[PDB]
Amino acid sequence: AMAMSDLPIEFTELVDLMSLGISPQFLDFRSTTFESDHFVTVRETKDGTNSVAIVDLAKGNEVTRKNMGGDSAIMHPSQMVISVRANGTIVQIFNLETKSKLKSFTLDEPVIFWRWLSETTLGFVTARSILTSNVFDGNVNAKPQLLTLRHANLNNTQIINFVANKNLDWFAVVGILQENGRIAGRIQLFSKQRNISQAIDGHVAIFTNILLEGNGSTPVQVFVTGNRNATTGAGELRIIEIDHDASLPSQYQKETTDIFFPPDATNDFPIAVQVSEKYGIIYLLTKYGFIHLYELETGTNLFVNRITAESVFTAAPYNHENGIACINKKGQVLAVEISTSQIVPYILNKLSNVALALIVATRGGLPGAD
């Protein structure tokens, strides 16, 4: 419906990985990890003596290549810390500027998936359990503390995400499976203080905050989740409040919104979701490359646009969690960010559009034309 130029969002290409000598075989969800807009980590398994490329997106996409002997490697959201795992069992986390081994241990059961829950905490998911590690606590040989057990709805799925709230007492683990020819998503929600889990359908999940009128300067906590039904194709975005403070007068009213899928994208599904707390914007990215911008307080879709033709396989927050970055199958890392300085021109054009539409309606059956 619209072009990139006319929409009030700025589009950037942070790096072309393939123009840096990165082979297309390593541009997949398990080989190229994306934890923040600071580093890209490419695990190159090529002849036994595997290597890792760390692309520093901040310092002019500088490539630091080192030979590594593991089957997975990820970078810290902002520091120069690398976590490496081998056989799913031996885990070793290093600071690269102090040359110091922050952590080193061996789990009993292998780790299927891991991700940084916060600047301080790294989450692990095994075939049966969900664990968490404070890698900066000083205890080098300390194995991760068990968080909870995997809900049965996650069985026979591949875990693709692990998200937490800022207080680290609400968690969501996202797995997907193949169903009715499409991709179905399952989410385990977990409240730590209640020690209770809940099973929902969904491809994407995130926790965020929003200041509501009347609550002063105190935010309210909301959980955002996106799903597309593998059977019906219906897609839904849901925003629901968690742990409301009774001293606050205004609470977030649960919102549900339809997610749009064009007729050619029947096998598309949501792959990522990021939220700008500052601007109250939900960015929902799909695998085919469609970005949706929703307004956080009302859940209303502001606009939909196609930012890439190649499929995306991973995403992350961009700027200071004000936008969304993603890596497509080609290796382009693309960033999308709302730009308030472009909203006024966008509004002026929409006002012209509605004036013209009114005029043609008066050409039809609307009272007018004098």
Binding site: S191, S197, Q198, I200, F223, I240
Partner: peptide, 6 residues
């Protein structure tokens, strides 16, 4: 019953 109305 459930944690949330999801």
């Amino acid at each position: 019953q459930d944690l949330l109305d999801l």
